[PDB]
Amino acid sequence: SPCPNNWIQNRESCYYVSEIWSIWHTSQENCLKEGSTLLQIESKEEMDFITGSLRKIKGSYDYWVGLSQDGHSGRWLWQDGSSPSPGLLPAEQVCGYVKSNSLLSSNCDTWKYFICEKYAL
Ligand SMILES: [Ca+2]
């Protein structure tokens, strides 16, 4: 009831972990269809939850998150225009993804799974 069916809750947030691949932009459109957006990780607490959650899921797959790198600055932004902290910078158009315990960087036009996030009721 705070979260949709098939979604997982942590505090104010609900998350959906995909079982299909898409490119970064299309993954975002998939989240948008569900009234959500690609996962944004704004704290160590949330990162720890996300890494913990994926560990319960087979494989150490790649999951798009809502981070993209400007082609002029090289600077990372979440899709709401906020900057990640120095603890959540992807390791070295380009977009970010989570794999196991790490945030990494990839060409946006590649196929990965994705994680969506929306506010719980
Ligand atoms: Ca978040």
Curated annotation (Swiss-Prot):
Changing W21A: Abolishes binding to damaged cells. GO terms for biological process: positive regulation of cytokine production; receptor-mediated endocytosis. Changing W111A: Abolishes binding to damaged cells. Functions as an endocytic receptor on a small subset of myeloid cells specialized for the uptake and processing of material from dead cells. Recognizes filamentous form of actin in association with particular actin-binding domains of cytoskeletal proteins, including spectrin, exposed when cell membranes are damaged, and mediate the cross-presentation of dead-cell associated antigens in a Syk-dependent manner. Residues 10-117 form the C-type lectin domain. This is C-type lectin domain family 9 member A. In peripheral blood highly restricted on the surface of BDCA31(+) dendritic cells and on a small subset of CD14(+) and CD16(-) monocytes. It comes from the Eukaryota. The chain holds residues 111 to 237 of 241 of the full protein. Keywords: Disulfide bond, Endocytosis, Glycoprotein, Lectin, Membrane, Receptor, Signal-anchor, Transmembrane, Transmembrane helix. It is found in: Membrane. N-glycosylated.
